[PDB]
C-alpha cells in the first residue's frame, strides 16, 4: 500500500491538449435552434401551434 | 476689487510663475505634458461646509484646467445604448471614450480592485446629473478620496448638441468639493498658463466663491494665498476689516 | 453551499422554458423581424472532460458517489494536470 | 484553565463586536472581545481578538472557523500563543467606541461665543505671521 | 531592355506583372531575366531588396508555361529559402504571378503541419518554395512526392543558408535531386568560400556570373510587451512611428487588433497584395503623422522615410543586417532572457541607451483585451496564427545562444497575444 505517486500530474500542463482549430459555430448563434425556430414558424403559419 | 476694495492680483501671480520656473532643481518613456498645478488657497471666518457634499461645484473657467486630451467616462442612467449612440452621433468618441450605465457600473465593478482599475483607466469621470447621488456608493473612497470625483453633466433631455455643450463646459470648468473646514484649496490651472490667464482664473473663482461658497462672501473671507503642490502660499490678499469682523461674528 | 449558490444562478433552461423562448422567436419570424451568447453551467462527463483538456473549465464539481467509480476516478488527477 | 486568545481576520462588514460575541459565545463563554477600529472615525479594521476561558476551546474555534467562506471573504482564525499576546492587547475590550465628531467640535471651536480679550488673543501679531512669509520671499 | 514589356513574356505573366504594379525593371532583373529565359545556369550576387524575387520568379514561371506543366508532372521548380519568413514572402509573390496561370504552387517550411504538407505534395505542386530542413525531410520520407521531373532549381541568399547551419542539408538535397537538364540558380548577398563551394557542386560547369554590387532598448517582460507597446503608441499618436515584427501573421493580428481597439494603424500586409502594400507604404511616406506595421523582411529593400520612431517590437531575424540598417529615435523591445543581445551589440560596437517606464502608466486593459479576442472569431484566429508564427520565427532564429525559445516562457508570450493560456501550437 505505497502512498500515491504523482509522477505525471505533479506539474501543470500549460497548453490545451488539442491543437484542432476552433469552429465558427461557437461564435455564431446556434443553428439547431434556428432550424427549430423555422420549423416552429411553419407550424404557426399552418395553424398547428 | 470685490475682495477688499482692491485687487492685488497680476504682480502676485507673475511672481509665483517666476518662482515656479526658477526652482527647477534615467530618462523614462511614458511621458506626459503634466505640469505642477496652480492651487489657490482661501481661508474663511467660519466653516463654509456643514458636511462633505460629494458633488463638485462647476466653477466655470475660461482657461480649462483639464487637458483637452483627457479621456472621459460618461456615467448615465440605463439604458446605455442610447447615450453610446448619442456620443457617436455627436463625435465625442475621442473625448467620451466610454459610456457606462448605472446598473452596469453597479454590477461589473464591485471589487475595489475593479473599482481601482476603472478609476485609473480614465482621467475624468462625467456622470449624469440624475445618477450622481448613487455614485458615493458603487465607487466609495477609491474614487471620492483618491482624487476622482464624478462631475454632474446634465444630459436629461439627451440630444447631440446639449451633450457637446455639456462636455465642453465640463472640461472648461474647474471643480471644488465642499467639505467642513475654514480653509480650502481650489485649482486655478497649471504653470503652462500665462500670468494673465491664471489671474483671469483667480478672479472668476473668487467671484464664484463669494456667491455660492462663502455665504457672506468677501466679508466672510479671511485671507487668500496662491500656491502650487510644493511652493510657498504666496499671500494674494488679506482682509483689511477682519479686526472688527472677527469681533462682531464671535460674539 | 456557496458553490451551489453560484451554480443555481447558471442553471440551464428547462425544456419548457427553452420551448417558450424559441416560440417567441418563431412568432417574430412569422409576423415581423443580435442576441447574446448564453451562460450556464456545463454538464455531461464527456463534455466536461473535453473542457478540462481544453483548459476552459474554471471550476469542476465531481460527484462523490458515482457508482462505477472509474467514470470519475481519473478526474481529480486530470484536473490536477490541467 | 489557560486563557486562549484567538485572532479573527478578514471580518465581513457587519460582523462586529456584538455579532462576534453572540456567535463565539456559542462555542463557550467569551471573556474579552475587542475588534480593532480606526482612531479618527472608529470604523472597523476588519480584524479582532477574542479571549476564551480554555485554550482548548480557542483551538476548537480556530479549527472550525479558519478559512470560512463568509460574504465573499475567507475568515482567518488563528490562535495567538500567549508569549506574544500582550497584556494591553485587550485594552478597551467590551466597551463601545466613541465616534468623536472632530469636524463638528472644530466647527463649534470656530464659531463659539467669544469676548474681546479672546479676540485680542486671537489676532495676536498676525502682522508677524505676514512678516514671516515676507522673509521667506 | 528597360520595362517588363521588353521581354518576350506571355500575356498571363504580363497581366500579373501589371496588376502587381511593376513597370520598370531593376538592374539585377535586367542582368538576370534575359539569360535565365534561355536556360542558362546563373550565379548571381545582389544586395538587399534589389528585386531578386521577381528576378528569378519571372523566367521560371515563363518556363513553366512553355513546358505546359500539370500537377501530375510533379515538381518542376524548387526555390530554397533560408528562413520561413522569406519563404512565405516568396510564396506570396508566386501566388500573385501565378494568379492567371494553371500551374500549381505550394510551400513546405519548418514548424508547419508536415502531415498536411505531404498531402499537398502528392497532389502535385509545380512550383515549390521550401526550406532546406523540411525539403530534405520530404525528399526522403514522403512517398508519392514527385520531383524526378525537376527542371529548375533556385537558391536564394545561400550565404545566409550556410550560416544558419544548412551545410549538411544542402549537399544531401543536391545528392537526392536530379541534376540533368535542370537550370540552377544561386543568389547570394556575399561571396564566401562556402558559397563558391555550393556553386561548384550545384551549378553546371561554367555558370554565368551576374553581380550588381545609436540604439535604444526597453527591458519589458513578455506578458507586458503588448501593453507597453499599446500605451506607447497611444502616447505618440501624433508622430510618425514604424514598427518591425518577425512574422506577417503577427503583423496582421496586431493591425487587426489595434484597429479593433480603435488605434488607427497601417500595415505592409494588406491582403498580401503587392500593389496594396506599395500603396500603403506610399501613403505612410506622404503623411507626416501615422503609424505603420511591417516585418523586417518587408522593410529590407524599402527606403525608410523620415520617421519619428522606429520600433523593433520583435527581435531581428538578421542581427548582422539589423546593426547596419540604422546607418527620429530607435527603440527595441527586449526581454530579460534576451539581455545577451546587449553583449552582442557591444561586440558589434554600437552605442546604446536604456529606456525605462513606470508600471503605473502601462495600460491595464489585459482583461478587456482577452475578452475581445475570445469574443471574436476572426480576432482569435488571427491571434492564434500570430502567436504560432511568432514562436516558429523564434525557434528558427540564428542566435540560438541569445534568443533561446526554451528560455522563453510560453504562458507570458500568449498573455501578450491575448490569451489566458497558451494555444496548442506545435513548436
B243 contacts chain D (CB < 8 A):
yes
Contact E355 B29 (CB under 8 A): yes
Contact E423 A16 (CB under 8 A): yes
Residue with cell 515549390: E128
Per the annotation, does E47 bind a ligand?
A: yes
Region class of E2: left (phi > 0), else alpha (psi between -120 and 50), else beta: alpha
- Nearest Cα to E81, choosing from E44, E131, E138, E152? E131
Distance from CA of E411 to the nearest CA of A (A): 7
Residues 6+ apart with CB under 8 A from E180: none
Q: How far from chain centre, in Å, is Cα E269?
A: 11
Q: How far from chain centre, in Å, is Cα D41?
A: 9
* Cell numbers at E309, concatenated: 520612431
Chains B & D: contacts with CB separation below 8 Å: 38
Touch B-A: 3+ C-beta pairs under 8 A: no
d(CA B99, CA B105): 10
d(CA B6, CA A46): 89
Q: How far from chain centre, in Å, is Cα E286?
A: 25
Backbone angles phi, psi at B44, to 5 degrees: -110, 170
Backbone angles phi, psi at A34, to 5 degrees: -65, -40
Q: In sequence order, what E strands does E208-346 have?
A: 208-211, 215-219, 240-245, 266-267, 290-295, 309-312, 329-334
d(CA D101, CA E311): 57
Intra-chain end-to-end CA distance of chain D, in Å: 70
Residues 6+ apart with CB under 8 A from B50: B180
- Strand ranges of the sheet holding B151-153, from the earlier edge strand across to the other edge: B96-101, B72-76, B124-128, B151-153
Q: How far is CA D118 from CA B238, D27, D125, E335, in A?
A: 21, 59, 14, 69
Q: Where are the alpha helices (DSSP H) in E98-155?
A: 114-123, 132-141
Mutating which of D41, D72, D119, D137 best tests the B interface, going by the most B Cβ atoms within 10 A? D119
Contact B225, B183 (CB under 8 A): no
**Residue in E377, E422, E423 nearest the CB of A27:** E377
Quick one: CA torsion of D119, D125, D131, D136, rounded to 10 degrees? -80
Q: How many residues does chain E have?
A: 427
Q: Specify the 3-state DSSP secondary structure of E409.
A: coil
Contact B108, B78 (CB under 8 A): no
- Nearest Cα to E68, choosing from E3, E142, E12, E143? E12
Residues 6+ apart with CB under 8 A from E308: E236, E239, E240, E241, E328, E329
d(CA D12, CA D46): 7
Q: How many helices (H) and strands (E) does chain A have?
A: 1, 0
- Nearest Cα to E410, choosing from E391, E397, E389? E391
B33 contacts chain E (CB < 8 A):
no
d(CA E40, CA E208): 7
Touch D-B: 3+ C-beta pairs under 8 A: yes
Measured CB to CB, residues of chain A less than 8 Å from chain C are: 6, 8-9, 11-13, 15-18, 29, 33, 36-38, 40-41, 44-45, 49
Neighbouring chains of A at 3+ CB pairs under 8 Å are C, E
Residues 6+ apart with CB under 8 A from E238: E289
Per the annotation, does E70 bind a ligand?
A: no
- DSSP result, D47-95: EEEEEESSHHHHHHHHHHHTTEEETTEEEEEEEEPTTT--GGGGTTTTS
- DSSP result, E9-60: --HHHHHHHHHHT--B--HHHHHHHHHHHTT--EEEE--TTSSHHHHHHHHH
D118 contacts chain B (CB < 8 A):
yes
Query: CA gyration radius for chain D?
Result: 24
Backbone angles phi, psi at B49, to 5 degrees: -115, 130
Backbone angles phi, psi at B71, to 5 degrees: -80, 145
Residues 6+ apart with CB under 8 A from E86: E156, E157, E297
Strand E183-188 with E42-45, pairing: parallel
Backbone angles phi, psi at B82, to 5 degrees: -60, -50
d(CA B205, CA D102): 29
Contact E60, E127 (CB under 8 A): yes
DSSP B58: E
Region class of E242: left (phi > 0), else alpha (psi between -120 and 50), else beta: beta
Amino acid at each position: 500500500y505505497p502512498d500515491y505517486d504523482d509522477f505525471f500530474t505533479n506539474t501543470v500542463r500549460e497548453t490545451p491538449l488539442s491543437s484542432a482549430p476552433e469552429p465558427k459555430r461557437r461564435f455564431a448563434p446556434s443553428k439547431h435552434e434556428q432550424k427549430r425556430i423555422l420549423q416552429l414558424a411553419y407550424a404557426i403559419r399552418k395553424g398547428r401551434i | 476689487e470685490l475682495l477688499g476694495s482692491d485687487a492685488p492680483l497680476e504682480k502676485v501671480c507673475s511672481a509665483l510663475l517666476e518662482y515656479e520656473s526658477k526652482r527647477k532643481s534615467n530618462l523614462l518613456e511614458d511621458e506626459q505634458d503634466d505640469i505642477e498645478p496652480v492651487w489657490l488657497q482661501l481661508a474663511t471666518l467660519k466653516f463654509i461646509g456643514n458636511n462633505r457634499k460629494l458633488i463638485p461645484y462647476k466653477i466655470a473657467i475660461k482657461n480649462p484646467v483639464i487637458p483637452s486630451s483627457s479621456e472621459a467616462c460618461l456615467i448615465v442612467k440605463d439604458p446605455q445604448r442610447v447615450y453610446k449612440d448619442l456620443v457617436n452621433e455627436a463625435g465625442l468618441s475621442k473625448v467620451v471614450t466610454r459610456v457606462i450605465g448605472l446598473s452596469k457600473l453597479k454590477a461589473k465593478w464591485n471589487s475595489y480592485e475593479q473599482k481601482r482599475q476603472l478609476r485609473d483607466q480614465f482621467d475624468i469621470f462625467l456622470a449624469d446629473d440624475r445618477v450622481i447621488p448613487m455614485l458615493p456608493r458603487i465607487l466609495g473612497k477609491t474614487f471620492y478620496q483618491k482624487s476622482k470625483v464624478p462631475v454632474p453633466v446634465k444630459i436629461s433631455k439627451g440630444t447631440a448638441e446639449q451633450l457637446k455643450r455639456e462636455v465642453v463646459s465640463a472640461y472648461g470648468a474647474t471643480y471644488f468639493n465642499s467639505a467642513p473646514c475654514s480653509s480650502f484649496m481650489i485649482k486655478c490651472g497649471h504653470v503652462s498658463n500665462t500670468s494673465t490667464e491664471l489671474a483671469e482664473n483667480v478672479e472668476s473663482i473668487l467671484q464664484f466663491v463669494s456667491k455660492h461658497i462663502v455665504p457672506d462672501g468677501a466679508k466672510g473671507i479671511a485671507s487668500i494665498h496662491l500656491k502650487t503642490s510644493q511652493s510657498i502660499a504666496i499671500p494674494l490678499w488679506n482682509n483689511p476689516n477682519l479686526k472688527e469682523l472677527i469681533a462682531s461674528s464671535r460674539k | 453551499t456557496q458553490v451551489f449558490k453560484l451554480l443555481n444562478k447558471y442553471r440551464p433552461e428547462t425544456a419548457a422554458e427553452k420551448k417558450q423562448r424559441l416560440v417567441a422567436e418563431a412568432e417574430a419570424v412569422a409576423n415581423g423581424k443580435v442576441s447574446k451568447k448564453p451562460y450556464n453551467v456545463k454538464y455531461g462527463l464527456n463534455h466536461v472532460v473535453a473542457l478540462i483538456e481544453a483548459k476552459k473549465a474554471k471550476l469542476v464539481l465531481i460527484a462523490s458517489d458515482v457508482d462505477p467509480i472509474e467514470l470519475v476516478v481519473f478526474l481529480p488527477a486530470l484536473c490536477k494536470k490541467m | 484553565k489557560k486563557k486562549g486568545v484567538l485572532y479573527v481576520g478578514r471580518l465581513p462588514h457587519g460582523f462586529y463586536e456584538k455579532q462576534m460575541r453572540m456567535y463565539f459565545s456559542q462555542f463557550g463563554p467569551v471573556l474579552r472581545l475587542r475588534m480593532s477600529r480606526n482612531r479618527k472615525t472608529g470604523s472597523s479594521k476588519h480584524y479582532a481578538f477574542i479571549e476564551f476561558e480554555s485554550l482548548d476551546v480557542a483551538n476548537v474555534v480556530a479549527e472550525t472557523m479558519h478559512n470560512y467562506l463568509l460574504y465573499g471573504k475567507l475568515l482567518q482564525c488563528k490562535v495567538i500563543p500567549e508569549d506574544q499576546v500582550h497584556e494591553n492587547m485587550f485594552k478597551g475590550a467590551d466597551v463601545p467606541f466613541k465616534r468623536i465628531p472632530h469636524a463638528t467640535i472644530a466647527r463649534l471651536q470656530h464659531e463659539k461665543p467669544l469676548s474681546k480679550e479672546k479676540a485680542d488673543k486671537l489676532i495676536t501679531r498676525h502682522n508677524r505671521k505676514l512678516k514671516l512669509k515676507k522673509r521667506k520671499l | 531592355i528597360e520595362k517588363f514589356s521588353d521581354l518576350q513574356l506571355s500575356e498571363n505573366i504580363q497581366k500579373a506583372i501589371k496588376e502587381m504594379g511593376f513597370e520598370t525593371m531593376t538592374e539585377i532583373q535586367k542582368r538576370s531575366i534575359p539569360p535565365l529565359l534561355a536556360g542558362r545556369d546563373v550565379l548571381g550576387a545582389a544586395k538587399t531588396g534589389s528585386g531578386k524575387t521577381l528576378a528569378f520568379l519571372i523566367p521560371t514561371i515563363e518556363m513553366l508555361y512553355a513546358l505546359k506543366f500539370k500537377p501530375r508532372n510533379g515538381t518542376g521548380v524548387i526555390i530554397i529559402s533560408p528562413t520561413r519568413e522569406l519563404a512565405l514572402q516568396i510564396f506570396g509573390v508566386a501566388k500573385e504571378l501565378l494568379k492567371y496561370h494553371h500551374q500549381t504552387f505550394g510551400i513546405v517550411i519548418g514548424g508547419a503541419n508536415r502531415r498536411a504538407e505531404a498531402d499537398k505534395l502528392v497532389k502535385g505542386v509545380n512550383l515549390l518554395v521550401a526550406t532546406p530542413g523540411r525539403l530534405l525531410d520530404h525528399l526522403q520520407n514522403t512517398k508519392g512526392f514527385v520531383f524526378r521531373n525537376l527542371r529548375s532549381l533556385v537558391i536564394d541568399e545561400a550565404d545566409r543558408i550556410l550560416e544558419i547551419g544548412f551545410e549538411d542539408e544542402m549537399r544531401q538535397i543536391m545528392k537526392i535531386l536530379p541534376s540533368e537538364n535542370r537550370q540552377t540558380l544561386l543568389f547570394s548577398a556575399t561571396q564566401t568560400t562556402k558559397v563558391e563551394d555550393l556553386a561548384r557542386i550545384s551549378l553546371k560547369p561554367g555558370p554565368l556570373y551576374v553581380n550588381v554590387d545609436e540604439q535604444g532598448y526597453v527591458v519589458v517582460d513578455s506578458d507586458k510587451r503588448f501593453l507597453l507597446l499599446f500605451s506607447f503608441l497611444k502616447r505618440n499618436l501624433k508622430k510618425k512611428v514604424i514598427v518591425f515584427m518577425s512574422s506577417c501573421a503577427s503583423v496582421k493580428y496586431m493591425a487587426e487588433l489595434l484597429n479593433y481597439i480603435d488605434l488607427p494603424v497601417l500595415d505592409l500586409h494588406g491582403k498580401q497584395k503587392q500593389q496594396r502594400r506599395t500603396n500603403t507604404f506610399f501613403e505612410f511616406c506622404n503623411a507626416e503623422k501615422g503609424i505603420l506595421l511591417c516585418t523586417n523582411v518587408a522593410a529590407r529593400g524599402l527606403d525608410i522615410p523620415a520617421v519619428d520612431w522606429i520600433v523593433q517590437y520583435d527581435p531581428p531575424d538578421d542581427p548582422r543586417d539589423y546593426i547596419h540598417r540604422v546607418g527620429g529615435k530607435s527603440l527595441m523591445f527586449l526581454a530579460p532572457s534576451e539581455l545577451g543581445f546587449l553583449r552582442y551589440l557591444k561586440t558589434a560596437k554600437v552605442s546604446l541607451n536604456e529606456f525605462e517606464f513606470p508600471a503605473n502608466k502601462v495600460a491595464n486593459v489585459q482583461s478587456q483585451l482577452e475578452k475581445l479576442v475570445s469574443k471574436n472569431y476572426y480576432l482569435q484566429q488571427s491571434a492564434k496564427d500570430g502567436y504560432r508564427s511568432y514562436l516558429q520565427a523564434y525557434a528558427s532564429y540564428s542566435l540560438k545562444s541569445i534568443f533561446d525559445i526554451n528560455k522563453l516562457d510560453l504562458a507570458k508570450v500568449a498573455k501578450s497575444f491575448g490569451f489566458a493560456h497558451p494555444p496548442n501550437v506545435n513548436i
